Amino acid sequence: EQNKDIQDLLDKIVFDAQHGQIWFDENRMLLMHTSILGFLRKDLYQMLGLERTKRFFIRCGYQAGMRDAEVTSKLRPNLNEAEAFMAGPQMHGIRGMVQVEVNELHLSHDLKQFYADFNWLNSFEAEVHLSEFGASDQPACWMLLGYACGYSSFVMGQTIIYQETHCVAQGDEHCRIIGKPLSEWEPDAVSDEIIALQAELN
Amino acid sequence: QNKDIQDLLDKIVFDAQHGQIWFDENRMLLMHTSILGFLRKDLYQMLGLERTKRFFIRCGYQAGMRDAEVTSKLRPNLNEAEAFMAGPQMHGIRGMVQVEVNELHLSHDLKQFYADFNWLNSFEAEVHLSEFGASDQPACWMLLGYACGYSSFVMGQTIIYQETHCVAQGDEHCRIIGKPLSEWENAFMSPDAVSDEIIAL
Ligand SMILES: [Zn+2]
Ligand SMILES: [Zn+2]
16 A cells, blocks of 8 residues: 555566566565675675775675666656656665665756755664674765666766765664765765765764 | 475565565575675685585575474374475476476485486576586585485484486486485585585585
């Protein structure tokens, strides 16, 4: 009854337990344990840097986001920018990664203008990061955040960057992000700006 | 419809509104296979193939051991074999691989195990092809770790598999034989010991 606006998305998800397949349109998926992600994160951190690990989860996310936007692209042409864009935040729910809640969204392809402010609720990433690390000193939601930047950047034809303003990892009640075109912040590893920003805004 | 998997599908809930996916206690993620391809490409070039391969078995092993924990006391009114099938079934629910049983005999009590399965539509195989193309040797490492991790735990001893044909080598499907450790004609902390073992291919 109540995934009225999700439904068109669910309609592309095919479970096929009997053949070891799960599909979103043309692409496969895997139902994965979060605590297994928690291990992959700590093991990576142990092998590489905080920095190289960080960088991986973000680039990862950027990818997932771009692919979902490819997918959900030819999918709501009846609708407008805002309602189509939403597919993104909805997919993050669908994949059980995070609950997106919109404080503010203003966008327009042709104006090359974007500003998003959302609350992330129930982030897995923050939850797993606490087990393996405890109270962090920076935000933890790298993957979610890469995906955020990715999805968005696909949708507008320009690079959209997010800052995680508050994070459950850091003790904040919910997590929160803000997203604006790269330049409105005063070779496509956009991965490096994200880290440089959370740095050069102490 | 397909009633062999129900006691599993049941323990799964999709709360898309609050962005949680649920397996009993455990919380789950529906993910692109891209994160695993990427990880494969990055690791391949930062560390050896040996190192990348090992890491992947280790990861596969942790998930095998988890489902093993979770499905543990779930099928007490069936026998060892149908109980055990939980792992192979889970691997398919998780959309990683279809397991088609060629042969299976197990006794926890007698310390006995022999599994010979076919793997079909292996996701790992797929990933390796579109990152590295034809392998020299079987490539379904994550999958193999799981096999090893799951079996091992149920059995309460060290069960090691070998991929014997792999889509990654042009075979039509992949194949695997799992025996106990001592039944191989070649010779905690121990979770790392075991990954070290299933790495001698
Ligand atoms: Zn967070
Ligand atoms: Zn294979």
